[PDB]
């Protein structure tokens, strides 16, 4: 199964100029495009190698449609400043995420479209793609305008249509890189923290996609106390990294096992300190 997602941010800049607009597109955990209103080109730009083969008609249409959205977001920053009774002095943010999911047969599974103001839920398209949920009374104004203009219909036509059709084509053109499941390369480190305690650190490196579980067990029972789990992080080469650490009584290392679950492991993997 696969996803395509776009991520839009507009930021008003009182004391600078027009709002900063930034767009990024993803297939699963791979970015393929960007647009930045401050960059010289004023164009949608390739960020993955398999999108470079699209012709100038692709780049012209994508640039026009994302610029149109940056204009809507500029007017929208003004409107929402009105709705919340805020001064022209302050900087405010509109975020938008949307996209579709397809199964391994390329068929529509799901659509999403969600909007935020100042880092908080504003309005969401419901999973039926026909109706909206507003976070507050300001967003209820938006919802009523969007019901009256039948905006749900244009979103449904995109998510069940162009969104799914173009994701399939992206998965075919990028098949050499986007269909890969790179399993984690694993190891364990040990550091004395005192004469009576030590840290075991369980590593997963070089994995794709990002979704992974590291769990520490003691005698077969899941262990949350005395652990640290860092956020999955990019290596910067297309792979991801994660680690999990547990503090253990010294000479009791053998009681602890680390479990690794990932799409690319046929059987789950268990690490124990030698």
């Amino acid at each position: 199964s696969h996803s395509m997602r776009y991520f839009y941010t507009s930021v008003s800049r009182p004391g600078r100029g027009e709002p900063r607009f930034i767009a990024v597109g993803y297939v699963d955990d791979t970015q393929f495009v960007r647009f930045d209103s401050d960059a010289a080109s004023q164009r949608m730009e390739p960020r993955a190698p398999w999108i470079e083969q699209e012709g100038p008609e692709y780049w012209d249409q994508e640039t026009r449609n994302v610029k149109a959205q940056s204009q809507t977001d500029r007017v929208d920053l003004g409107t929402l400043r009105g709705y919340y009774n805020q001064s022209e002095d302050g900087s405010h943010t509109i975020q938008i995420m949307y996209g579709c999911d397809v199964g391994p047969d390329g068929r529509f599974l799901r659509g999403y479209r969600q909007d935020a103001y100042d880092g908080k839920d504003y309005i969401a398209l419901n999973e039926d793609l026909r109706s909206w949920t507003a976070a507050d009374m300001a967003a209820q104004i938006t919802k009523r305008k969007w019901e009256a203009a039948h905006a749900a219909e244009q979103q449904r036509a995109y998510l069940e249509g162009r969104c799914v059709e173009w994701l399939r084509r992206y998965l075919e053109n990028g098949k050499e890189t986007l269909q890969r499941t790179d399993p984690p390369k694993t190891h364990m480190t040990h550091h004395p923290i005192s004469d009576h305690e030590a840290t075991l650190r369980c590593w997963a490196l070089g994995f794709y996609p990002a979704e992974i579980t590291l769990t520490w067990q003691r005698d077969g029972e899941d262990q949350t106390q005395d652990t640290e789990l860092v956020e999955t992080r990019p290596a910067g080469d297309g792979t991801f990294q994660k680690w999990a650490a547990v503090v253990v009584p010294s000479g009791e290392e053998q009681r602890y096992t680390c479990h690794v679950q990932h799409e690319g492991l046929p059987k789950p993997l268990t690490l124990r300190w030698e």
Partner: peptide
């Protein structure tokens, strides 16, 4: 590809 031009004001 991105959602088409004809978006609706908030």
């Amino acid at each position: 590809v991105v959602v088409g031009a004809g978006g609706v004001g908030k």
